[PDB]
């Protein structure tokens, strides 16, 4: 599907992917529109031209992340205040919960934790990083006080990228506009590592604007670059924080912006940057799998629907929030690229059918595939 313009979506966690398109805070109409809506969408509804249920808001969004379906949508608003919303059953109606602003006039990113779905994250401008407990958060907006980690480098660099550990609710990562990506241990209450690339081979300290961890391994983080030239992804294995265990090179031209490293699969990394291009890489080796065309130029968000991995969306200041399929093979029926695919699109692991896939056949014989996946097997069982 496709819909209204400018906005930073957030995907749900139901197999019936639902979208939350709050309005962004970067662009402006040709006639200066104003009120952001925070509309909701479903891939079914009549021509998806009408939102399921909107909810007019004061200011505009900077981010939106859906707690792990716990019907909690965190918004990072213009005016350094985050607000949680509710939605009483997907498809039904979006309603607003509490709103905070323990921040210093600026809320940029909002990330929800995988394990311990009751934890959230926000990044401000003073290098502000907060951690709320969604359980005792709705309690009293009084001025509930979230937690702080605390360490190394700040100034006015605003954390504009939050990502948790996908194997230890214990850890996460900070990234902004500095040449340093931060690794955070919450039981050690403090930064524990300073990722920092500079080996461009053209010796230029690169900035780490984005961080996305590996979906299974507790020691791998993706660190995208900001530089408008020789942008990279760099796979770090904090087993050794001195050199990137892998480097996804020569893909984007101008800087990068967004990274979503598949969950169902660990060999599928989505990538959106400052150019009219969306890439899908294979972070194991580094082969560039396919290049999906973009809204026109500059896409901030791009994610796999959390639970429908063949589905992904691309937010863009350009025009509208576009949802696409991991595939879109040249038809035959109907003949502005469609989606040129480089070194193939390597079938996603949620297609790997190790299953014995048996079949009954002529004379009551039961065919199949052995426990070695390479050897067939024919037999005639006892129906009893």
């Amino acid at each position: 599907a496709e819909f209204s313009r400018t906005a930073t979506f957030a995907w749900s966690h139901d197999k019936i992917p639902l979208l939350v398109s709050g309005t962004v805070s970067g662009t402006v109409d040709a006639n200066f529109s104003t009120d952001s809506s925070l509309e909701l969408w479903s891939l079914l509804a009549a021509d998806s031209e009408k939102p399921i249920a909107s909810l007019q808001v004061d200011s505009k969004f900077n981010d939106l992340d859906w707690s792990h379906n716990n019907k909690i949508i965190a918004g990072a608003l213009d005016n350094g205040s985050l607000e949680l919303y509710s939605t009483n059953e997907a498809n039904n109606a979006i309603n607003s919960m509490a709103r905070f602003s323990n921040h210093s006039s600026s809320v940029k990113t909002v990330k929800f934790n995988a394990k311990q779905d009751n934890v959230l994250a926000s990044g401000g401008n003073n290098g502000e990083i907060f951690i709320w407990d969604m359980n005792k958060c709705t309690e009293s907006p009084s001025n509930y006080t979230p937690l702080t980690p605390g360490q190394s480098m700040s100034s006015v660099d605003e954390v504009i990228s939050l990502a948790w550990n996908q194997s230890l609710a214990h850890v996460f990562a900070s990234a902004g506009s500095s040449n340093f990506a931060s690794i955070w241990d919450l039981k050690a209450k403090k930064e524990v590592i300073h990722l920092s690339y500079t080996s461009p081979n053209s010796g230029i300290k690169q900035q780490l604007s984005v961080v996305e961890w590996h979906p299974k391994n507790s020691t791998r983080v993706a660190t995208a670059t900001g530089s408008d030239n020789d942008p990279s992804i760099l796979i770090w294995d904090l087993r050794n924080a001195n050199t990137p265990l892998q480097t996804l090179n020569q893909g984007h031209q101008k800087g990068i912006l967004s990274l979503d490293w598949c969950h169902q699969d660990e060999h599928l990394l989505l990538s959106s940057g400052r150019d009219n291009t969306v890439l899908l890489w294979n972070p194991e080796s580094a082969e560039q799998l396919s290049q999906f065309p973009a809204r026109g130029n500059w896409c901030f968000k791009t994610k796999f629907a959390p639970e429908a991995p063949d589905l992904f969306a691309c937010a863009s200041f350009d025009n509208k929030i576009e949802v696409q399929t991991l595939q879109n093979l040249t038809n035959t029926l109907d003949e502005s690229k469609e989606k040129p695919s480089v070194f193939h699109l390597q079938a996603p692991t949620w297609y790997g059918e190790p299953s014995p896939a048996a079949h009954w056949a002529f004379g009551g014989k039961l065919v199949q595939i052995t426990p070695d996946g390479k050897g067939v097997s024919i037999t005639n069982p006892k129906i009893s």
Binding site: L333, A347, P356, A358, W360, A361, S377
Partner: protein
């Protein structure tokens, strides 16, 4: 009668001709193989190639139209090849869908030389092979996220086939000369996750039997009796099978369930006198 190491890449499908004398294997290596099976022997004939991505499933056509085997791959294309003169050649290539095609079964010879294609492109296609080579395709949207199965219903219009959803929904479709194409009938809900596979039985006994396997790790045997009659959801067991569930197959006669798991184990089931299920 093992055919040890037929492929290099992991194998995705093992199907035999109507006379269980010749097989057909397909894998990720994008290649399919034809075979001969006797007592315990396995003669390897040709190796089908022209598939760009991993081959998913294949299906033997009725001898009525000679020797034909159809394959579908990630490459968003299904291909059929005949065996005129003992030498395998590619007869026609069907690629209407935009994305992987995960299932392809042939229609009961009665219907004709028809093939039912279900792609992950969310749509499904029906294609019969005329004379000259150019076929008249029939496509109709069937599911949200995509389509994973497309088993047929026996002969009886009155042409029916079940679809398994990427969106957790199992459906029934019946032809319609007035609609020009197969339209929806049922919409049996039941699985919490994705419908990995659904096979329809040929058991002509009083009531219809349909199987549905899914990532939700359960099988829901859909039993209905007549037009009016609604389909009765039935848990093959009130527990979860340790792993997913990929395939479900119906025995020729005696109506027994072949449920190819994911825990790498194949289980057989039968409906005892009451109406429940047990091993074998």
């Amino acid at each position: 009668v093992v055919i040890a190491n037929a492929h290099n890449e992991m194998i995705h499908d093992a199907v035999m001709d109507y006379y269980g004398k010749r097989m057909a294997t397909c894998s990720s290596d994008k290649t399919i193989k034809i075979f001969e099976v006797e007592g315990e022997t396995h003669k390897l004939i040709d190796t089908l190639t022209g598939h760009e991505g991993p081959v998913w499933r294949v299906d033997w056509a009725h001898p009525k139209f000679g020797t034909i085997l159809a394959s579908c791959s990630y490459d968003g294309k299904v291909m059929i090849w005949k065996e005129e003169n003992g030498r395998w050649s590619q007869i026609a290539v069907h690629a209407v869908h935009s994305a992987s095609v995960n299932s392809v079964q042939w229609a009961p010879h009665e219907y004709g030389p028809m093939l039912l294609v279900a792609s992950s492109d969310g749509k499904v296609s029906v294609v019969e092979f005329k004379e000259n080579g150019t076929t008249s395709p029939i496509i109709i949207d069937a599911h949200a996220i995509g389509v994973n199965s497309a088993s047929w219903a026996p002969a009886t219009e009155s042409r029916k086939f079940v679809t398994g959803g990427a969106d957790n929904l199992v459906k029934i479709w019946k032809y319609n000369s007035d609609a020009q194409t197969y339209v929806l009938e049922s919409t049996l809900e039941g699985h919490s996750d994705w419908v990995r596979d659904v096979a329809w039985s040929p058991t002509v006994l009083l009531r219809s039997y349909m199987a549905s396997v899914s990532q939700d790790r359960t099988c829901i045997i859909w039993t209905q009796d007549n037009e009016q009659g609604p389909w009765k959801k039935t848990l093959l067991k009130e527990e979860k099978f340790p792993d997913v569930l990929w395939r479900a197959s119906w025995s020729l006669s005696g109506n027994v369930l072949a449920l190819s798991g994911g825990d790498n184990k194949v289980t057989l089931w039968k409906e005892n006198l009451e109406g429940k299920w047990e091993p074998a």
